[PDB]
């Protein structure tokens, strides 16, 4: 899927609270080019919830999460 | 849908060519907060195809398009 002139799945603001990996289901790091890099924890509802790339606990949940 | 810490449907680069309103089906202006405002013509395939907000012909297709 060559990205040229289309949409770009990214995040805007990061959640102000370490989403418990238990309530989260996964995480999707932004495409990597939208002035807002991060990791979108796709929780139970799986709403693409952002969580900030450098929020420390964020990476603690990324690795703790298993690529399903 | 209160947008706080989640994804943000936006566009990255604008298509370098006035998408013929005939091949387009609609257009979705970015959420309005991602350093990349524009109008993403959702054409036949409806891939969210950006087209730049100030590309002139872009607005000529936005109004020419009927909100279906």
UniProtKB/Swiss-Prot annotation, chains A, B:
Q: List the disulfide bonds.
A: 10-34, 11-50
Q: Which gene encodes it?
A: CCL5
Taxonomic lineage: Eukaryota, Metazoa, Chordata, Craniata, Vertebrata
List site positions: Cleavage. 2-3
In Swiss-Prot or TrEMBL terms, this protein is called C-C motif chemokine 5
Q: What is the effect of changing residue 1 to F?
A: Antagonist of the chemokine receptors CCR1 and CCR3
Q: Which residues are glycosylated?
A: 4-5
Source superkingdom: Eukaryota
Q: What is the effect of changing residue 8 to A?
A: No effect on inhibition of activity by tick evasin-4
Q: Which residues of the full protein are shown?
A: 24 to 91 of 91
Give all Methionine sulfoxide modified positions: 67
């Amino acid at each position: 899927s060559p990205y040229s002139s289309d949409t770009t799945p990214c995040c805007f603001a990061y959640i102000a609270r370490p989403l418990p990996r238990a309530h989260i289901k996964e995480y999707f790091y932004t495409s990597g080019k939208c002035s807002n890099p991060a990791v979108v924890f796709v929780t139970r509802k799986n709403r693409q919830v952002c969580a900030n790339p450098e929020k420390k606990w964020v990476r603690e949940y990324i690795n703790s999460l298993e690529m399903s």
